[PDB]
Write a protein that binds this ligand. Structure first.
Ligand SMILES: Nc1ncnc2c1ncn2[C@@H]1O[C@H](COP(=O)(O)OP(=O)(O)O)[C@@H](O)[C@H]1O
Ligand SMILES: Nc1ncnc2c1ncn2[C@@H]1O[C@H](COP(=O)(O)OP(=O)(O)O)[C@@H](O)[C@H]1O
Lengths: 132, 169, 373, 48, 256, 191, 195
């Protein structure tokens, strides 16, 4: 129940994956999980992020396939560098910095799973020239 | 032969079949496919600025980014837009009246126009209004006239008008 | 098979030792090592006089083992096929080898080369043009096998004495020289090969550069002891040297295939004597006056028009041609060997450009200390 | 928003005309059995 | 077979980070993976990268290992999330290329027919080159030369990925690498342009000098075919300035 | 339970397609691969067996996996036309099996040799010393005609099983026919 | 020979092939379970430099899904009321159209139950039209094999109260097929083209 002035060390390649995934799945509100680790309470660092195809159901927890996520994590461990899951990202063309009702529900499930599971709103359409 | 003939069964069942993984990907490709909004370019604002009317909503302006061949785009052309990508990603020709298209391209298998008798004068009227203008424009060029436009048929409800229309179709 | 082995142990001194090896190899079912033994016996210092008998024995052994190495067997039995020396049945022999080994390996394409070689020896009209073209048409997805490529290069080099290919025949002969590096054959025959290639360049028309043979040590050292006047003439064609006396001595030095085309030698050397001015002077002397042309080509005034015409056609000089002052503008788009021993000239010009660029960069920096400092 | 329903398939799917002019079909919510909903009856739809 | 390749500003930093993260325990200096992208109009582009731990031995350069099952699973996942992305080539660090590249290319070309090699200089930033592209051509070295490997460089240019301008501007936000300050910025444009021209042409002069000394093998058969025209092109004739004495000097004097 | 991770390097030399065994020696070695993989599967179906090649290449596609069909499919039509590179083959087998695997999984490399080899004695002794320093556990099984259990192979095995090692043996097979059950009888339960 | 390798691929390549459309279909059938935009097909036969489509959506939008990525235009003939993706903006699947308000159910009886026994008097005429209408329904294959296409237009004229309506419904019941009744005297509509 301690949340100070926390800061996220997001990586540039994580940004590039975000913009590429959003540019690919523009109107679909594509989903993903931000691969980060709580090195301490508030200095969270994210080095990598992945792109996952949103299922036809829409924004659902089962859309992020658990077996596929586990296999992806194992692939990262074997080749690359392992990294924990304490966050998520989502291209949000609908409206701005808030979460829809279903987004809140799936973030609540993520919060139950993880410790914080930060709710990150990235708007792929509003970011055009200077402000992402 | 058992190791020969049992093969010839199993691959044939597929061929046309087992053609699903890519159909699945294509419709998944559709699942994350961006749907690009469609308008008609009313006029070209500048060489890079083009005034386009959404078929329903307001006129926007968009701009080709690097290689969309802005020269071939014309006032009234069809292009695909996205409220996010800010540009035209590809261009698209026109339409063909689909409802009319199929009901005008579903002429049933008829018999020749020679299978109806007593209307040879009407047959040659159809020939010298349809075939003659396109086969021999040189004669009419020496004439120096435009070919006629249309012909009217009328009379008792039973004449063969539907047969003649279906035969020429 | 044991009976044939017993019969085959005779008909040669030292053969039964190899035949015992052959007996062991098929006892343990060896095919590749068997091909090496067959390779050793065929390349043994003997003429293989019993060509028909050994053909029957080899076909006997191969047909009852039916697992030998295909490409290497055909590489070896082809010696027996050529040695049998009867073209009417030799074509059937090559078809039989094709039927016995019809795989897409070196075997089939080698059989095609054998067909083409036979057509050269007799009947040079039946399938000669189709065969030679089809070899290259079938060397697809085969970048560096280099075995049958050398074969194809050899046939087409021997096809130089045919109307179809003269300049291309020289090109593939160079390809043979590159692909096979060691001598692997008498120096005198290579010197003869160098003589034929030299005559090919002299007689040819499109071979203006004709690189990899002008100053190539592999080709020149063959004739470094005999007919060095051929070495000098090719060097004249390379560096643009005229040596009209020596080149005329070249014309009647090797009378066959040179006497009729000595006029073509005149035109080519006049064509290629201007390149020495072209690269040495990077537009430093861009006024190619008639007197300068006369010094470079020792040609008359009326022939200058034809020479510069052919120069524009081939690609030596593409500049404007005047006649009030007779000035030829200098552009070259067909580079060739620049006598790498004389690379100091272009190195000096390049370092001159480096000094000029750096000096002007420093000068503008000196004029710009009021902004950049 | 609430709108009428048009028709349905054999059982699971429901082809519906909506006051948003919508050619609308949905899996009926788990709390609602297909028996209760009948053709030509107004049903509210959750925007999500 | 491709005409040219174009590298995005999208994978260069990803490869460098992959080098950094897997180099913690693997100090082989050799990082080998695959670059994924698309090839549409004789222009090849790279959109994704992946690194695999990779060890080497100097003995004939034939000692190595990879995780091909994991790498193949990555490709399936990448294609599933984005169908247009496909393996365009395989990359290796260590610009001093060794001999195992031919074996790696043979193994990975089952994913891409025109297998290409890419070298990323993680630590080196010599002048501005982030990476280099390599095409495998073993179809005879030349007309009259012996057999060789001869991995040539297909021309590579850094492309302009979309939607990354926002991120890069926010990232740097300190240098402003744009034409801002038109007069001063173009002066800097002239400065390093002369710096690049002087450095590269000096390298060409050094190569000509070293060819003259002959300590290194001479690839003259393409060197003089490409540099002779460069030298003889008549850009030194000043009589066209005489014909164009007012080339723009009229525009110079009106601007004054 | 003590689980075994085995990486097999199979001799795809130019001679392996000969018919010394009934189909071929290449198929006989393939039959040697799937029976030992079957035995690993019967011990525990999640035992993993992977393929390594040494015919101027190192096949890694068939990774350290329990499934055997990928080995059978990929090793089939291997085109046994190239040469043999013994020094590279076992070494790359070490690196490939050095990849991510359970620490409980016992590391073991098995080698199949069926053709005569022409390699330097000094180079292979240097490899044996290097593998001795690296504490490598490799057993080698021969097949068909060869200078079977040659001086290089005997010294290579002796270094890898000596100094109170596992005790893996190399069998001196008769040229041509061989009894694969007798070849793998000892290392399947002892070594 | 070469079977056991082929089919171990084939049966595996059969089942995995079909499973992914089973995945995909689901991934698009939930979208097909959530279509929201009517399909006012304004077609283009856009041959790729095959076809294409314009969909006037319910929310007054237009979506040019390329080459119609899911449904063949042979069955996707133009009209309205054919599934369109709410998110992918693609044609989803065909569905029944709208039967012109009045025609949806004007007086259509699903199945009449009146029997032929309760009518009579004109038995020669009723048997005549049964042979011309009912037999072309039950024994339609008899006419197909014979080669004579049965006539369709039967005009039953006579003063009211002669049992024409019962006979038509009784014949429809005997055919066990759909019966549609038209209120002829009220087809004269003031709206143009309404009738
Ligand atoms: N001149 C004719 N020759 C042959 N058949 C005819 C003729 N006139 C009418 N029919 C018959 O009438 C039917 C076609 O109707 P039609 O008279 O063409 O309608 P409309 O007169 O409204 O065009 C066909 O079954 C055909 O057999
Ligand atoms: N043959 C018949 N058998 C039984 N009822 C009949 C018969 N003929 C007429 N009807 C009666 O007539 C009514 C149908 O009237 P209507 O359809 O207006 O006559 P029509 O069909 O001659 O125009 C029915 O209610 C039916 O009870």
């Amino acid at each position: 129940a301690v949340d100070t002035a926390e800061q996220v060390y997001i990586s540039s390649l994580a940004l590039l994956k975000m913009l590429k995934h959003g540019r690919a799945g523009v109107p679909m509100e594509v989903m993903g999980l931000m691969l980060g680790e709580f090195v301490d309470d508030y200095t969270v660092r994210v080095i990598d992020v992945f792109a996952m195809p949103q299922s036809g159901t829409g924004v659902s927890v089962e859309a992020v396939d658990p077996v596929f996520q586990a296999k992806m994590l194992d692939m990262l461990k074997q080749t690359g560098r392992p990294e924990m899951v304490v966050g998520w990202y989502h291209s949000h063309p609908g409206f701005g910095c808030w979460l829809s009702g279903v987004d809140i529900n799936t973030q609540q499930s993520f919060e139950a799973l993880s410790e914080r599971a930060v709710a990150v709103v990235v708007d792929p359409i509003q970011s055009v020239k200077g402000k992402v | 032969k058992e190791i020969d003939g049992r093969l010839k069964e199993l691959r044939e069942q597929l061929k046309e079949l087992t053609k699903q993984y890519e159909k699945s990907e294509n419709d998944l490709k559709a699942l994350q496919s961006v749907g690009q909004i469609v308008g008609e370019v009313l006029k070209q604002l500048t060489e890079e600025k083009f005034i386009v009317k959404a078929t329903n909503g307001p006129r926007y302006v968009v701009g080709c980014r690097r290689q969309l061949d802005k020269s071939k785009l014309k006032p009234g052309t069809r292009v695909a837009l996205d409220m996010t990508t800010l540009t035209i990603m590809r261009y698209l020709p026109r339409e063909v009246d689909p409802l009319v298209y199929n009901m005008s391209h579903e002429d049933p298998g008829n018999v020749s126009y020679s299978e109806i008798g007593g209307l040879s004068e009407q047959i040659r009227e159809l020939r010298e209004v349809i075939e003659l203008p396109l086969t021999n424009p040189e004669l009419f060029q020496r004439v120096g006239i435009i070919p006629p436009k249309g012909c009217l048929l009328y009379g008792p409800p039973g004449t063969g008008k539907t047969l003649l229309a279906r035969a020429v179709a | 098979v044991p009976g044939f082995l017993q019969q085959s142990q005779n008909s040669g001194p030292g053969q039964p030792a190899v035949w015992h090896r052959l007996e062991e190899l098929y006892t343990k079912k060896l095919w590749h090592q068997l091909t090496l033994q067959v390779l050793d016996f065929v390349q043994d210092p003997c003429f293989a006089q019993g060509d028909g008998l050994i053909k029957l024995y080899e076909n006997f052994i191969s047909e009852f083992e039916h697992r030998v190495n295909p490409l290497s067997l055909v590489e070896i039995i082809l010696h027996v096929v050529r040695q049998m020396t009867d073209p009417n049945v030799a074509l059937t022999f090559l078809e039989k080898t094709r039927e016995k080994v019809k795989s897409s390996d070196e075997a089939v394409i080698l059989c095609k080369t054998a067909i083409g070689a036979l057509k050269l020896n007799i009947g040079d009209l039946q399938v000669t043009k189709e065969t030679i073209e089809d070899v290259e048409e079938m060397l697809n997805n085969l970048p560096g096998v280099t075995s049958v490529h050398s074969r194809f290069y050899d046939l087409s080099s021997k096809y130089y004495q045919t109307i179809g290919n003269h300049a291309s025949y020289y090109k593939d002969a160079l390809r043979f020289l590159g692909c096979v590096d060691i001598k692997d054959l008498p120096v005198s025959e290579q010197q003869e090969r160098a003589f034929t290639l030299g005559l090919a360049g002299l007689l040819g028309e499109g071979v203006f550069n004709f690189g990899e043979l002008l100053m190539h040590p592999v080709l020149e050292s063959l004739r470094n002891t005999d007919r060095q006047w051929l070495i000098d003439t090719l060097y004249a064609f390379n560096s643009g040297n005229v040596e009209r006396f020596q080149t005329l001595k070249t014309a009647w030095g090797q009378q066959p295939d040179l006497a009729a085309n000595e006029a073509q030698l005149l035109r080519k050397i006049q064509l290629l004597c201007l390149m020495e001015m072209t690269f040495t002077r990077p537009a430093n002397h861009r006024q190619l006056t008639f007197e300068e042309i006369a010094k470079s080509a020792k040609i008359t005034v009326n022939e200058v028009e034809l020479l510069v015409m052919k120069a524009l056609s081939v690609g030596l000089v593409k500049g404007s041609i005047d006649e009030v002052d007779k000035r030829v503008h200098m552009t070259w788009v067909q580079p060739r060997v620049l006598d790498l021993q004389q690379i100091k000239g272009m190195k000096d010009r390049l370092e001159f450009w480096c000094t000029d660029v750096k000096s002007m960069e420093m000068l503008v920096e000196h004029q710009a200390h009021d902004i950049l400092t | 928003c609430t709108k009428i329903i048009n028709a349905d398939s054999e059982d699971p799917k429901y082809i519906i005309n909506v006051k948003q002019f919508a050619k609308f079909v949905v899996d009926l919510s788990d709390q609602v059995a297909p028996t209760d909903i009948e053709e030509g009856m107004r049903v509210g739809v959750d925007r999500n | 077979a491709v005409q040219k390749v174009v590298v995005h500003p999208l994978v260069l930093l990803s490869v460098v980070d992959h080098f950094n993260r897997i180099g913690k325990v693997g100090n082989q200096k050799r990082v080998v993976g695959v670059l994924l992208g698309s090839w549409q109009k004789k222009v090849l582009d790279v959109s994704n990268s992946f690194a695999v731990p990779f060890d080497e031995d100097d003995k004939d350069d034939s000692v190595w290992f990879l995780d091909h099952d994991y790498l193949e699973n990555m490709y399936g996942m990448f294609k599933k999330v984005n169908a247009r992305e496909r393996i365009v080539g395989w990359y290796h660090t260590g610009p001093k290329l060794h001999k195992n590249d031919i074996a790696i290319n043979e193994l990975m070309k089952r994913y891409c027919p025109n297998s290409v090699l890419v070298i990323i200089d993680v630590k080196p930033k010599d002048l501005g080159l982030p990476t280099e592209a390599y095409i495998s051509v073993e179809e005879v070295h030349d007309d009259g030369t012996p057999t060789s490997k001869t991995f040539e460089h297909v021309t590579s240019e850094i492309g302009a990925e979309e939607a990354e301008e926002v991120g890069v501007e926010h990232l740097l936000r300190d240098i402003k690498d744009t034409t801002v300050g038109t007069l001063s910025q173009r002066i800097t444009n002239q400065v390093h342009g002369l710096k690049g021209l002087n450095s590269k042409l000096l390298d060409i002069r050094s190569y000509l000098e070293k060819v003259a000394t002959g300590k290194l093998p001479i690839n003259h058969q393409i060197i003089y075919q490409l540099q002779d025209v460069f030298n003889l092109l008549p850009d030194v004739s000043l009589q066209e300035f005489v014909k164009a004495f007012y080339l723009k000097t009229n525009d110079q004097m009106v601007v004054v | 339970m003590v689980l075994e991770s085995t990486m097999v390097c199979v001799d795809n030399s130019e001679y392996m397609r000969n018919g010394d065994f009934l189909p071929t020696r290449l198929q006989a070695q393939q039959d040697a691969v799937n029976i030992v993989c079957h035995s690993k599967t019967r011990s525990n179906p999640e035992n993993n067996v992977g393929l390594i090649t040494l015919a101027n290449d190192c096949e890694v596609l068939t990774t350290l996996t329990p499934d055997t069909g990928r080995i059978l499919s990929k090793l089939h039509t291997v085109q046994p036309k190239g040469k043999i590179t013994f020094c590279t083959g076992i070494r790359v087998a070490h690196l490939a099996l050095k990849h991510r695997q359970g620490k409980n999984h016992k590391m073991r490399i098995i080698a199949f040799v069926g053709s005569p080899v022409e390699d330097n004695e000094k180079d292979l002794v240097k490899l044996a010393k290097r593998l001795k320093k690296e504490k490598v556990n490799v057993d080698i099984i021969n097949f068909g005609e060869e200078e079977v259990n040659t001086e290089k192979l005997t010294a290579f095995v002796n270094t890898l099983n000596g100094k109170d090692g596992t005790g893996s043996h190399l069998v001196t097979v008769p040229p041509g026919p061989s009894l694969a059950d007798a070849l793998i009888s000892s290392p399947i339960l002892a070594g | 020979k070469i079977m056991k390798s082929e089919v171990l691929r084939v049966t595996h390549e059969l089942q995995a092939m079909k499973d992914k459309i089973k995945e995909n279909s689901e991934k698009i059938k939930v979208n097909k379970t959530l279509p929201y935009l009517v399909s006012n097909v304004i077609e283009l036969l856009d041959v790729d430099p095959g076809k294409c489509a314009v969909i006037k959506t319910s929310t007054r939008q237009t979506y040019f899904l390329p080459v119609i990525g899911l449904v063949d235009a042979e069955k996707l003939k133009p009209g309205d009321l054919v599934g369109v993706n709410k998110d992918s903006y693609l044609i989803l699947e065909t569905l029944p159209t709208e039967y012109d308000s009045r025609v949806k159910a004007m007086e259509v009886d699903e199945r009449p139950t009146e029997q032929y026994s309760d009518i009579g008097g004109l038995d020669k005429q009723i048997q005549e039209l049964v042979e011309a209408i009912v037999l072309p329904m039950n024994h339609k294959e008899k006419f197909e094999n014979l080669g004579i296409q049965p006539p369709k237009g039967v005009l039953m004229y006579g003063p009211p109260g002669t049992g024409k309506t019962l006979l038509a419904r009784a014949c429809a019941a005997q055919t066990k097929a759909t019966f549609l009744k038209l209120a002829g005297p009220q087809l004269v509509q003031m709206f143009i083209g309404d009738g």
